[PDB]
Symmetry: D2
């Protein structure tokens, strides 16, 4: 009949050991020399099914890895930008060796539910993985098309034909993982199934995520983001692919953090140094239960914050030492304090301060909590480096959002991470949020990427360039077209296309009309 087991019991153990050995051998590849796996080959194989699946995503990540390995070793950089759709990706393939898929661009132009909006990662998590597939399936198509044209013409005739590399690895945005760890693994699975060569996940909290240059970004504990990076690697291992994992931190300008449970975040959590105040939350509640609204509540909250005199604990300590009237050598004590207290938890920092003769210090990080229950933090490059260093073992590349295209801070960040992991690859957001004309003169704009590459930033990208380029020409053309009709098409579009040799100008051929026509003749012939 039709009854049979998935696997004959007699062979279950054999197949398991054999597969386990294969994974341990795989993990030995140089690809993983910087990767820390807090789990065993046995644990991973034990989660796999009986049918091994191969993914073209794997090939692309291997390709991407070969590229970034070179770039970093030579202190050069591969740079690209956020691609919106297929037309754009086929043109980018001629000059850029990678492709970036922006979640910001996806919210405004590719939500799988078609409901657009600001960059809040609040679209269905199928969104970015579907954009990857949208571009990848188009890349695979134009590759087949072109190979067909090339192999179809006499060898001596090929020098005239194009030879574009359409299979440019795609790095996609995973936002914060769209939920818990089980969601992170499912998202990663889609990304691999859809073709991503690599993905990036940020240490922000889902439900509140904002674009890197917004005020009020909320972070998650360092341990939680590490879990996310581990979950991604675990899912990739289960699927047997080399998907690159990129860690992004928003600790530079972040002002909030979900919990203070992780001692590594203690040094940066703001505490109320005023013993007389009642909790902000209590104050704010009473304020609302009294009709206070808008600017009132704000004023009431603003005053509380000021009287609170919020500071990181080390600052609270240094201020006490310097204001003292009994402590001998304030500079010496403060100096010894800061040195020993670095990276210590709050309890240990307090213990250190007391051992150095400083009196007890009032420091309360609960009273300043927001109505949601979040804690306030004073981030910055130092906070960013701390996090990057902690993520490093679980990240193939690290990225830190910044406020301006500041070379020095990029240097500061890089040297900070490299002090611990000299070979850690770095990625950088050449954000269009920065007013580049105001930020730096042309000559420096022209060398910025190169200068950053010298620092280890081997992969750089202009997040929203696709959006802006499409908007600019659309605004320009639609206007001209409305003013002078077809004169605008020939002048602003068709002629420039010819002069530049844009292959799309010959739309029929560019679309694969001949390619499919030959597929047809082959079947009917």
């Amino acid at each position: 009949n039709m009854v049979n087991p998935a696997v004959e019991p007699s062979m279950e153990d054999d197949l398991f050991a054999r597969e386990v050995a294969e994974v341990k051998q795989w993990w030995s590849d140089p690809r993983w020399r910087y990767t820390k796996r807090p789990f065993t080959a046995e644990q991973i194989v034990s989660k796999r099914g009986n049918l091994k699946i191969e993914y073209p995503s794997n090939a692309q990540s291997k390709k991407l890895w070969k590229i970034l390995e070179g770039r970093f070793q030579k202190r050069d950089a591969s740079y690209t930008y956020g691609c919106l759709e297929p037309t754009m990706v086929t043109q980018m393939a001629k000059y850029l060796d990678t492709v970036y898929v922006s979640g910001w661009q996806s919210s405004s132009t590719a939500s799988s539910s078609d409901e657009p909006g600001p960059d809040l990662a609040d679209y269905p998590y199928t969104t970015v993985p579907n954009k990857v597939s949208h571009l990848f399936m188009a890349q695979l198509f134009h590759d087949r098309k072109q190979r067909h044209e090339r192999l179809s013409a006499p060898k001596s005739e090929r020098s005239k034909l194009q030879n574009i590399d359409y299979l440019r690895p795609i790095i996609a945005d995973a936002d914060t993982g769209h939920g818990g760890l089980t969601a992170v693994m499912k998202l990663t699975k889609l990304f691999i199934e859809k073709g991503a060569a690599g993905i990036h996940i940020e240490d922000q909290a889902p439900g509140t995520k904002k674009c890197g240059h917004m005020g009020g970004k909320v972070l998650v504990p360092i341990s939680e983001h590490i879990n996310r990076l581990v979950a991604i690697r675990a899912q990739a291992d289960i699927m047997g692919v080399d998907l690159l994992a990129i860690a992004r931190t928003d600790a530079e300008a972040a002002t909030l953090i979900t919990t203070s449970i992780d001692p590594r975040d203690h040094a940066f959590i703001l505490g109320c140094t005023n013993p007389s105040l009642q909790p902000l939350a209590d104050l704010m509640n009473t304020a609302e239960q009294s009709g206070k609204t808008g600017d009132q509540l704000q004023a009431i909250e603003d005053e509380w914050m000021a009287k609170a005199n919020l500071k990181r604990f080390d600052d609270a300590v240094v201020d006490v030492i310097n204001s003292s009237s009994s402590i001998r050598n304030p500079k010496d004590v403060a100096a010894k304090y800061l040195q020993a207290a670095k990276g210590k938890s709050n309890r240990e920092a307090r213990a250190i301060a007391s051992s150095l003769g400083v009196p007890e210090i009032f420091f309360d990080w609960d009273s300043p909590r927001t109505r949601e229950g979040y804690f306030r933090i004073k981030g910055g490059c130092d906070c960013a480096i701390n996090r990057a260093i902690a993520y490093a073992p679980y990240a193939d590349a690290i990225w830190m959002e910044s406020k301006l295209p500041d070379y020095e801070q990029a240097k500061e960040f890089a040297e900070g991470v490299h002090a611990v992991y000299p070979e850690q690859k770095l990625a950088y957001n050449l954000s269009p949020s920065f007013n580049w004309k105001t930020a730096m003169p042309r000559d420096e704009q022209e060398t910025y990427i190169r200068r950053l590459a010298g620092l280890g930033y081997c992969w750089q990208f202009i997040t929203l360039a696709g959006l802006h380029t499409t908007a600019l020409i659309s605004d320009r053309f639609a206007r001209a077209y409305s003013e002078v009709g077809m004169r605008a098409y020939g002048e602003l579009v068709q002629e420039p296309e010819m002069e530049l040799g844009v292959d799309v100008v010959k739309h029929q051929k560019w679309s694969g009309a001949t390619y499919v026509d030959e597929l047809q003749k082959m079947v009917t012939g």
Copy 2:
């Protein structure tokens, strides 16, 4: 107890009666003064369910209808181009009053399966409606975004704020219908559900459909395309909306037709006039059943075709008249034959030539059929005019593809149609497949749309302008960007956006970040 009927059997008839009355009242509206409906209000209402649904697409078509009514009457035109995605649509809204969604563009950039390819209408049929929805949901969002910013500001400060009309009616490509009449109705249903103000369907056959300017187009019989147009209207009626139905004919350049069953197509079907030849099918068969396969079989067909001496029937008749000594008045016989046989079936035409004393005409349009069984046909503007006239009662606007931006032929096509229906709106494809620099000087390029508007082409569009504009800026920026890094971004993109005052340059605000933040606060 949870058992109850959908509707009380006692009131079923009263409700049906009232609905029918409404449908009839709706049909008397001037919106339908040119519309021929081969079915009754009772038939339509009998296909409806018990829960009436209203679609924003209906509002969009009414808006479209008002716009096109105005243009045609003033002999002006609204013109737009094929929009690729949301970023593009929000910019078009500033200068263009309508939006076009191309099936061609959808093939290379928007198939529902993500499998791209050439314009063959072979992607899943949800492809174009989904693109309509993609753009329509974005327009809706941006209209919300802008109203909030405007209403949130003091009346006195609004003059400084943008006042873009994002709700530009969308006209979509329904290809040939993606299957039979039931497929046509399902397609129209999704278009209506996705926000389409109008859709266009062409007289090519699905499966062999292709680019409007590609050689070898295959036509379906006139009756078939009319059925499609009627199917569209019926579905719109069932759903209670004013969806515009635009008919497109590919007869100007088409060389094939699927069948010879429709007498209206007989005047154009090509027949072999050499009684010594054997059917092309048998020849090619016998030929391939012995190697030769390749360019040899090709040439073998060209020769047959040459020997066949193919002609439209009227010409075959006239050729026999001018070579029959038994005919005393050849000029009179020919003229009389042409006058009477005009628009008649082959059988009627043969009966006419017969009555006029014309000898037996050897004409065989079956022998020239392709291996797929397709008949040959000589189309052209005259064939297209004939089809447009036959489609007009079931089409809100008519479109005839052309080989070149030829004003004279466009005027010829318009006159042909207006001779019978002087108020028939027309549509024109300002094709980017045409070499404009080579077609007409710049000053004439700028008057072209207006010239065409004077003829009644009240709605015109550059099918693939979105593709090309996007390709251009992408090639240019990507190249420069790979050459001078960030210098190119500020020089070619950011600074120009600033100069031009492009709202997107402040992407956060443009994306609706302020709008959602206020939604947030409202909910506290």
Copy 3:
């Protein structure tokens, strides 16, 4: 020249005022007599666009409202179960007046990405709203099919035909909202556009959400769940629909809470009473029993201060006392707090959610009538006309109740005010049962099993689907065709 404003400047204020007036008029309807809106009609309108859209969803929620108003007032109840797909829905339509779309069933049979998994609300949030569309579009189709049949047939023969009400209002699972408040509004927008008559949202946290009868369920603060419920009403108001919002609380068996920020939650947060103990988190590198966790009151009562401490924060609670409690040490690794759930806790939460919910549901460990009575009475002691909903969970082992009590359970709960009841996974279970039974028999005796276990039974019960072609709408579509070419 194709350039024109969205709205002429001189009309904007007049259009706003009029629309704001319409909304205030709408909100005065008795449908909203229990509804508390912490926002104004003006705030809502200034969030709308210039094109009003009407949804068949609004019609269904109105029909649903009319149904539940009746059930509650008569102290009866409508009961249904989770539906899997169209075939099942066309059959349920004949006997039950509402339809339920389970998030549990959706995870195992309908993720938008096709990746199955346990009930963790970790599929793309598009999942459940799509399942609603799936069934609703099918309901609409069959409504058309049947109307065509009845209307086209001789009036004297209509009594011999079916007259099924396929338009049975659907209530769907919105899990915990799938993220932040903006996600909640987007999800609601989807449910409304897809056909939902009402949706339910629970006070668990995304990422940790588990099915009602799971172990350590984690709750969000009372205030956070209220925001979710207000976000839902807010989206419905923007869209102009009457969508029902059902509040579910998992407080009866929850053991953890994300934060202690809300004072209404203080009365249930467990704190260590052993000064000798060091933080639990530190030890994890048991402590519990030794910690002697207690609620502040069960620690203060060691006379009648409880009467003035009721519903007070810990700060205010301590104050009352004067005239050792530490809840930080017990915190989990994630930073969560320990809490003692229970009916009392659920009642407290139910009461806080009430002004923002059309119906309230409290998960229970067993189908316990007495507990259901206690919950109902606790809520009603404050909001006597608050509709309640109940999960006739297939997770329970009914034989927990004798056959005779099984038959009256729904009726008894109905007396308590549980006007809407549902078996979450009945759809999954019925399909599974018949599938196993049939596939097994079919593998043994071939077509004999089909004639005996399926075909013959269908014809005897007169299942309309047995006439597959007619059922699927073959005659309906065939007529549509003849009408177009006729």
Copy 4:
């Protein structure tokens, strides 16, 4: 910088050559011994891209082939039925080695647009492949879940656990290809990407696709359907997979055909033998049809030739084009026969044909070289007819696998005695019908239990759930009764603990 070619010009030729070699090697495998490929390996490779992709569809394809090969050789059969969704597929997996995905069922319950309707193949063509993915992703998940459970337990205890083969090969409905040849290859590409082990395609016309037992089905020419089967194999070859291609013919009951261009169709096309009549179209336009039809005295050519005579004609006229048949008939003294198959045409332009089993055998034999299995859509469960069809096809291709659709509509209660009902499948398998299926069983079982339960539930409430659902599940040991474990809660909980 970042510019580089897709492939170095100095390597293209060699890679091409090596890949072309691999394809020829692949095609020499026994899997393809019965397969005719009207194209070259060089033609296929020249259509591929530079990135090779592996599909689990292929592994399943191989598995299915191994199964069917065994079945046919032993004259046994694998049989299954149309599956609706994941729940059903996990139960079917215990007792059935294959899974069928019905287009009919997909139309009433799975259109990718959610718009249901009768079986007319007019849903978006992503419908069926999407259903395949729906079931396959579910199979893959449960396979992992169970593997983890089994491996996580000590060997000595595994015999107490389930060991269901969830990876049951899925055969799916491709209708008529959903349009032209370019659509056929696209639809085939999706099926392969989605996980199909095999697909079947029928010889009806797409715009008028009807379900098997329908009134007037329209057929495409033999050559057109062969083009579809070849298009399927080509796409499979391009993708490097072993996808099974099943050819279905509706010629047993079809009454129309799009065109008379294919000579192999000539012996079945009905013609008018009445010379005094005007074409039907002309008649209809001048405005009765049945009237014309009757006065037309429609017959197949061979029959028209006979009547004329009243004759070795039938012998030499076998499988001959009309122009040949005519040439034959006359060479035997027979007078010019009046035959016109263009006058009977429908208003859509369709020709009339008299189908039947002989017509179906003809088509099946014509498709055989391009099909891994052949199926003749039939309505009545007639053992003798099935025998007639199989012997007809086997007379030419004795090792040609056959498929069979077990009528879900016909009344089996009176169709044959119970004994005969139980042996029907076994008897067909003996004829070479190595894979059989009940297209709509999934629909009916779900429909049956739903009506029964919804009714009982509305009558006795929870009592009904205990009596008709929960108790039986427990007594039958249905794993789904413990929904949490079954859904994979422990698998995911453990997955999370690992992280």
